Write a protein that binds this ligand. Structure first.
Ligand SMILES: Cc1cc2nc3c(=O)[nH]c(=O)nc-3n(C[C@H](O)[C@H](O)[C@H](O)COP(=O)(O)O)c2cc1C
Ligand SMILES: CCOC(=O)/C(=N\O)C(=O)CC
Length: 364
């Protein structure tokens, strides 16, 4: 089974290639990591296995879901440290995903009820609705388009959050540059209508992600930084006229950052365009993998068979699993044994209970 051959992800010696994909679960009450998160990640940790956390706030304006953790305060750092310690005791490697939602937010999630921030004034359309803290669904508002001073402040928020992640004991961080969130709102020409140095051309649209990645690489080292993108995705009105060219432009910049830094990033993590909340889709994935000088993690709709094939055929080095990892704490072992998998319950993906639908899915 190729999923159980070891893999050197830079300095990290992994014993298998099954990765816990980053998943927002909304148990981090008041944006503080809770003991429940420790039990959840401990359940899923394996010796030499790689885990990526739920998206984690970099600042008070970065959230668009209820009860998602932050890593911008010392209180949050202190509580993450307990979670990281229990995962490390199982021998796992764990990265914290740094997440800013940009315009995918609501007044209820913003300090003082202010407008969310974005590259543009364009709102997500009413085809999409935002989950509210009471379980109803609301309307995405018009965001505020930020200037270059505020852009530099957001870059600094990523940099400080990366340092805070290292202080908490994380092995590294992942930049959430995917899925129509803040970074993708700069990348995608269906969103970014700017006329300054951050829009107007593909090169300008890539400026923001480039600066974010350079800042975190400078702070913690390239080998502790992963980057997630999704150039082709049906999520929150985040479309590009040329997804493959957009992806390749991002890859070129990551390759150049590595050459400048003298070290490779931890990895590039790419969402299969099939995933929502063909050979054109497989065309895109393999084209980006072949273009990138480093470790490639694929995600989105993978199964045991599809993950085996991806690694066997050279399409990916690591395979991240989301939904099946929700309901199978021992997913790694089940994949190794080809054991039957448990169903997952969408109704408890984003509820707040520390146990129900979170840590009470059974082991084999
Ligand atoms: C409930 C849920 C929460 C998710 N949260 C995040 C997130 O916070 N950050 C992110 O990059 N992807 C997130 N994803 C996407 C997953 O990381 C992953 O790519 C996807 O679940 C893989 O497809 P699969 O569920 O078929 O394995 C989430 C997915 C689900 C189902
Ligand atoms: C569909 C692609 O977008 C995602 O997977 C995602 N976050 O990145 C969420 O669903 C947040 C809960």
């Amino acid at each position: 089974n190729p999923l159980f051959s070891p893999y050197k992800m830079g300095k990290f010696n992994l014993s298998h290639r099954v990765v816990l994909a980053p998943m927002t679960r909304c148990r981090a009450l008041n944006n503080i990591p809770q003991a429940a998160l420790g039990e959840y990640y401990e359940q899923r940790a394996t010796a030499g296995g790689f885990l990526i956390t739920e998206g984690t706030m970099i600042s008070p304006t970065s959230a668009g879901f209820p009860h998602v953790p932050g890593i911008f305060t010392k209180e949050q750092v202190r509580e993450w440290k307990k979670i990281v310690d229990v995962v490390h005791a199982k021998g796992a490697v764990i990265f914290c995903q740094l997440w800013h939602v940009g315009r995918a937010s609501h007044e209820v999630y913003q300090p003082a009820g202010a407008a969310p921030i974005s590259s543009t004034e364009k709102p997500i359309s009413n085809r999409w609705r935002i989950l509210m803290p009471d379980g109803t669904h609301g309307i995405y508002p018009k965001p505020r388009a930020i200037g270059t001073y505020e852009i530099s402040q957001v870059v600094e928020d990523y940099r400080r959050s990366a340092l805070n992640a290292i202080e908490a004991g994380f092995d590294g961080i992942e930049i959430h540059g995917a899925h129509g969130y803040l970074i993708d709102q700069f990348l995608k020409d269906g969103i970014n209508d700017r006329t300054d140095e951050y829009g107007g051309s593909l090169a300008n649209r890539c400026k923001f992600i480039t600066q974010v990645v350079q800042a975190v690489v400078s702070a913690i080292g390239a080998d502790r930084v992963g980057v997630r993108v999704s150039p082709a995705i049906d999520h929150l009105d985040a479309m590009d006229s040329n997804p493959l060219s957009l992806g390749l432009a991002v890859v070129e910049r990551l390759n150049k950052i590595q050459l400048h830094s003298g070290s490779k990033l931890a990895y590039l993590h790419v969402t299969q365009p099939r995933y929502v909340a063909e050979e054109e889709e497989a065309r895109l994935m393999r084209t980006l993998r072949n273009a990138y000088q480093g470790t490639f993690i694929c995600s989105g709709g993978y199964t045991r068979e599809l993950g085996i094939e991806a690694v066997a055929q050279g399409d990916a080095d690591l395979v991240s699993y989301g939904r099946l990892f929700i309901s199978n704490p021992d997913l790694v072992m089940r994949i190794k044994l080809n054991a039957p998998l448990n169903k997952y319950n969408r109704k408890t993906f984003f509820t707040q209970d520390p146990v129900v639908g979170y840590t009470d899915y059974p082991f084999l």
